[PDB]
Structure 1
Amino acid sequence: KETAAAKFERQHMDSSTSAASSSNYCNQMMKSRNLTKDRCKPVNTFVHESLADVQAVCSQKNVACKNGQTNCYQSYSTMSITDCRETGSSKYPNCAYKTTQANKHIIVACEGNPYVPVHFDASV
């Protein structure tokens, strides 16, 4: 099955754009990346940077994850990200999202060898 590493790329990476370009970005991307297949995923963040720069976070600032795990890492630099939150009109399978653009530090959990991001923990 899909590796934790590949799932992170599919759920969270968008190197093809610098930023969300219209209010429909989240609707289009949640759909196209297959995140609304079984249910409307309530929240999701997309990162508009090269994969190499996001992978490098695993060698940056070690921090505890929101759940208390100690394999979390925070980016030294801010990154271009898009936050997607379900709207009050969202109704499976017509999942609907509010697109919000932001520039923040990202916190990821890392695992494996190579040591790469497997979970997006938060943006700060």
Structure 2
Amino acid sequence: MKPKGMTSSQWFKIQHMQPSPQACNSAMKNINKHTKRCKDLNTFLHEPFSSVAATCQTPKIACKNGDKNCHQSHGPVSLTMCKLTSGKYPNCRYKEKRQNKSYVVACKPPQKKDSQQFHLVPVHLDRVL
């Protein structure tokens, strides 16, 4: 039923964590196994989910059309935009591009893995600014 061992922000930290995923090539490899396909593009952020968690506390914005569940960093964060360099789905290699911009990540209540309890863990990534 509901995930396990991979809280919402946890699944998104293996899919969008730059603190030290081991090269987008490998960071994306964990996604090709959970997606059985290489999304072709994957972005990551370089800030501890505890700091990104608090970063996701600044004013939000009507995500869909009034969801108000996104949160843009109050400044430029050393993020990393990885892209699929080439190879295919079972042999796709990515390149990590270290960029610095204020992005927008969405948040949700700590499922069950809750690294601590946050109450708005950094789950999705609305966009990069």
Q: TM-score, normalised by structure 2?
A: 0.75
The aligned residue for residue 115 of structure 1 is 120
Q: How many residues align?
A: 114
CA–CA distance in structure 2, aligned partners of residues 50 and 117 of structure 1: 10
C-alpha RMSD over aligned residues: 2.1
Aligned to 1:36: 32
Q: Distance in 1 between matches of 2:49 and 2:40?
A: 24
Q: Name the counterpart of 2:7.
A: 3
Q: Residue type matched to 2:96 in 1? A: T
Q: Segments of 4+ in structure 1 off by > 4 A?
A: none
The TM-score normalised by the length of structure 1 is: 0.78
SS in structure 2 of the partner of residue 107 of structure 1: strand
The one-letter code matched in structure 1 to 2:19 is S
Native 8 Å contact 2:14 2:27 kept in 1: no
1:47 lines up with 2:52 in the alignment: no
